[PDB]
Design a protein around this ligand. Structure first.
Ligand SMILES: O=S(=O)(O)c1cc2c(O)c(c1)Cc1cc(S(=O)(=O)O)cc(c1O)Cc1cc(S(=O)(=O)O)cc(c1O)Cc1cc(S(=O)(=O)O)cc(c1O)C2
Ligand SMILES: O=S(=O)(O)c1cc2c(O)c(c1)Cc1cc(S(=O)(=O)O)cc(c1O)Cc1cc(S(=O)(=O)O)cc(c1O)Cc1cc(S(=O)(=O)O)cc(c1O)C2
Ligand SMILES: OC[C@@]1(O)OC[C@@H](O)[C@@H](O)[C@@H]1O
Ligand SMILES: OC[C@@]1(O)OC[C@@H](O)[C@@H](O)[C@@H]1O
Ligand SMILES: OC[C@@]1(O)OC[C@@H](O)[C@@H](O)[C@@H]1O
Ligand SMILES: OC[C@@]1(O)OC[C@@H](O)[C@@H](O)[C@@H]1O
Ligand SMILES: OC[C@@]1(O)OC[C@@H](O)[C@@H](O)[C@@H]1O
Ligand SMILES: OC[C@@]1(O)OC[C@@H](O)[C@@H](O)[C@@H]1O
Lengths: 93, 90, 93
């Protein structure tokens, strides 16, 4: 397809800080990461036309949730330290 | 091309709120650590963003619902959703 | 064509609180601000069809990152206490 304009979502944590920026582009969401020393590409790569994100700390451990939507189906993807796993989020859109 | 979403979270449980704009209406799904359920937020909007903050242990949520060039702010402050003072000149 | 629905992004900090709302409208992003005493127009004004935002505190100092996208080009804008400056962010494409 052709990407008219991409759509991003962003989250951050700590004081360095760490930042994650998710970009929905041509039905694919990819991730860019900053941990204080340059931007690099993250492991998140899942389908989606629209993305939102939230994150929180448990102690010094980061937890990230990415809500990826295509059509009326939103899939939650979870980062809890050991790879991206599909979460329990469901909606009836 | 799809529904549009916005998400916020608070605490360490955590609580999460996910807002979805679909065909002109924004609805809300909630996580408080024990399963997803539908929340009380239901207002018009084609586009949505959200932010939230804690005062002590109390949560305050602001949802920015946009239709055309008009953005309406909706406020949760512990007892129902009320319209906020936000305006813009778009 | 009639102007399509605007797209917004929001961040907040502290307990007053301070809130910043960014609106992408007809290719331009503007900013509205709240710090407890009425909404007002902020200094941020840059091109973009899409906007996302994140912010974090270092002590009392707020740091804001706005991701403004036009086409497939995302520009990061940085607030670190004294004016907006362009950040190092580049995307995968
Ligand atoms: O159905 S698709 O999404 O695959 C599609 C592919 C192409 C298309 O040309 C179009 C759709 C139609 C079309 C849409 C738009 S938009 O909806 O406003 O984005 C714009 C154009 C257009 O032909 C005009 C146009 C603009 C530009 S740009 O100003 O540089 O972004 C480039 C092109 C355009 O045709 C060339 C072009 C690039 C691309 S690329 O995949 O982005 O390289 C695909 C297609 C192209 O015609 C080939
Ligand atoms: O096609 S739409 O469903 O978006 C539509 C909604 C409304 C409409 O009145 C029209 C279309 C017709 C219309 C078309 C055009 S044109 O296509 O650009 O020539 C222009 C107008 C118009 O009413 C005039 C107009 C423009 C604008 S602005 O471009 O955003 O400044 C706003 C309005 C206009 O009447 C007010 C308005 C707002 C809204 S909103 O969605 O609540 O913001 C809906 C409708 C409105 O008429 C109600
Ligand atoms: O250190 C990089 C990384 O592991 O950080 C956590 C998540 O953002 C992952 O997708 C990403 O690859
Ligand atoms: O650990 C994963 C999980 O339980 O985290 C909290 C929520 O995001 C849930 O939807 C998700 O499945
Ligand atoms: O526990 C559910 C609830 O009361 O939480 C706070 C707000 O998100 C409300 O819309 C929602 O119904
Ligand atoms: O208590 C509601 C309110 O004052 O909260 C702070 C801002 O969100 C204002 O727009 C809003 O009217
Ligand atoms: O007090 C307003 C202001 O300085 O707050 C920080 C940034 O949001 C600036 O763009 C904005 O003008
Ligand atoms: O001080 C600016 C900067 O270094 O802050 C951290 C990241 O946002 C970088 O992209 C950015 O250039």
């Amino acid at each position: 397809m052709k990407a008219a304009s991409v759509q991003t979502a962003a989250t951050s944590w700590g004081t360095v800080p760490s930042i994650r920026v998710y970009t929905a582009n041509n039905g694919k969401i990819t991730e860019r990461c900053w941990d204080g020393k340059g931007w690099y590409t993250g492991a998140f790569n899942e389908p989606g036309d629209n993305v939102s994100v939230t994150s929180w700390l448990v102690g010094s451990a980061i937890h990230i949730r990415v809500y990826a939507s295509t059509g009326t189906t939103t899939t939650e993807w979870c980062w809890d330290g050991n790879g991206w796993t599909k979460g329990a989020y469901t909606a009836t859109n």
